[PDB]
Amino acid sequence: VYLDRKLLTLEDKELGSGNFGTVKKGYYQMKKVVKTVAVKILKPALKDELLAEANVMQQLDNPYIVRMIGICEAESWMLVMEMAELGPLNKYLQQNRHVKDKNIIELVHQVSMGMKYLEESNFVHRDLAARNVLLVTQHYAKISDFGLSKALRADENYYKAQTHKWPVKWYAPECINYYKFSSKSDVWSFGVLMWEAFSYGQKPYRGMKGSEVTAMLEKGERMGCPAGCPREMYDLMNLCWTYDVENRPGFAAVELRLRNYYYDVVNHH
Ligand SMILES: Cn1ccc2c(-c3nc4c(-n5cc(N[C@@H]6CCOC[C@@H]6N)cn5)ccnc4[nH]3)cccc21
């Protein structure tokens, strides 16, 4: 869990940043090999958030979730993860506009497999967006960014937030109206992630305020079908955006629909 600072080498340049601080590339020296790593470096509330994020990630073991190597307390608090070299999914698709439809289905199906595992494990992600999916290769995606994640109580199917910055354009109506977060609210966010991927990393609800997004959803309106997106995939996005939590599908149903459609496209090609 606790790593040795003497075995960690950090690069000067930063990969990216957030409200927590920066993300940098590094190397962790093992006995016979060296591990390339991605490190979150903090800029009392942020320290507690990083320790809680590390506590969630250490409990997870799935091919489609980023692996945490450990934590280190040096000049600042650090969260060390296994490196996914190609970076965030939204940026990759903005820079590689020729990625084929079959390849987009493959990647979003991998995200649904990671989420099916998280649902089975009774954890809620609470920040599922394309910026938080990292690419190992052009054909292998992993979920990261567990800073808002929660382990559900044994007697409850949801997490209740006490006081509302939130990524509002990815949040379900019950999150906004009742501050209730469940695996089904993560399904709503997964629908927005699908729209971002098929739109090659474009931002959802372009040019709209948070209050204007609420009014749109209340009228029963939803974002349109991205250019070149198959009807079957747009139908699935719309099912993820079921207003009533009770009638919205869970990740077992979403993953099965994606798996069957992916195989249909593979065997047709
Ligand atoms: C531009 N850029 C931004 C990141 C990145 C990387 C890269 N980040 C990695 C990473 N994590 C990055 C975050 N949080 C950041 C916050 C800023 O927005 C993007 C992410 N959501 C959490 N885990 C885990 C494992 N491997 C990673 N590899 C590689 C190459 C380029 C990169």
Protein model, in words:
With 269 residues, the protein is α+β, with helices and mostly antiparallel strands. The protein folds into two domains: 1-83, Phosphorylase Kinase, domain 1, CATH 3.30.200; 84-268, Transferase(Phosphotransferase) domain 1 (Transferase(Phosphotransferase), domain 1), CATH 1.10.510. It is 37% helix and 22% strand. The protein has eight helices and twelve strands. The protein has a five-stranded antiparallel beta sheet with strand order 1-2-3-5-4, with helices on one face. Strands 6-8-9 form a three-stranded antiparallel beta sheet. The N and C termini lie far apart (45 Å). Residues 15-16, 18, 23, 38, 66, 81, 83-84, 87-88, 91, 131-132, 134, 144-145 line the site of the ligand Cn1ccc2c(-c3nc4c(-n5cc(N[C@@H]6CCOC[C@@H]6N)cn5)ccnc4[nH]3)cccc21. The modification Phosphothreonine is found at residues 22, 163, 214. Residues 9-263 form the Protein kinase domain. The modification Phosphotyrosine is found at residues 2, 117, 140, 158-159, 178, 261-263. It is found in: Cell membrane; Cytoplasm, Cytosol. It comes from Homo sapiens (Human).
